[PDB]
Design a protein around this ligand. Sequence first.
Ligand SMILES: CCC(O)(CC)COc1ccc([Si](C)(C)c2ccc(OC[C@@H](O)CCC(=O)O)cc2C)c(C)c1
Lengths: 240, 11
Amino acid sequence: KLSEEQQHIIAILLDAHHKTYDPTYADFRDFRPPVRMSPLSMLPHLADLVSYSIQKVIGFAKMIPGFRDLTSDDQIVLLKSSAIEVIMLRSNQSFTMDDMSWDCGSQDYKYDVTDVSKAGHTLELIEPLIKFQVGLKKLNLHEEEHVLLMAICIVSPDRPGVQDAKLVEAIQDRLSNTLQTYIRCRHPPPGSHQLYAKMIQKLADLRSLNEEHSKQYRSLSFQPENSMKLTPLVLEVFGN
Amino acid sequence: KNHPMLMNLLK
Ligand SMILES: CCC(O)(CC)COc1ccc([Si](C)(C)c2ccc(OC[C@@H](O)CCC(=O)O)cc2C)c(C)c1
């Protein structure tokens, strides 16, 4: 039932993800170190982490079949609006529900509710972020459906600023069809439709987590003392 | 353009 094109798309996205996600987390050692107490002691470390993650998201996105065919303007608006969502999404592979934290190789690089607050955020964001990660874990997604979800998140025609919405929608359609077909090859109805519905809802959830992170980011980065601790790529991508 | 570093990472 998975056509030749669908297996091909899936193989591409899996290779793109394995080329942009290091499960050894070896590069976390080159970030500014985590300081667990300026009540924003984790801001330098987590800023470097976010900056690193943006670069990984751009590398993944470039390998999405069809993304190259978009204009440069549409590639930029898609990555600017999607980046925080793909970061939250891809971070689930490091999320461990033992202690509701993101385990990234060691005790130093393990981030819990209070580590994120030490970068300036409140439970207004973190509480829905943790439950999002837990709900994602419950779904028990194949890596195949995970990378398809990240790609569908990026190529969305409803992002503000998108020029060629129809092309973007045509690219998303082929990824959507590919994921729907992968589910149907794996799960019979009605369970197949219940899973696809739970994944769509997670994309809706990321939109509202996006809006809430952006409001807190705008408040945090408005203080020059916080802006100073960010990185140039974060200020460019998350700003103007 | 406003995004030279992102443009660069897109090459
Ligand atoms: C700087 C902007 C800010 O708003 C302050 C102004 C802070 O923003 C944020 C601070 C922290 C986080 Si986070 C839930 C602890 C996270 C967790 C795990 C990650 O793991 C990456 C591996 O998945 C990829 C490994 C690899 O690719 O090799 C990445 C991240 C970011 C988030 C989501 C936003």
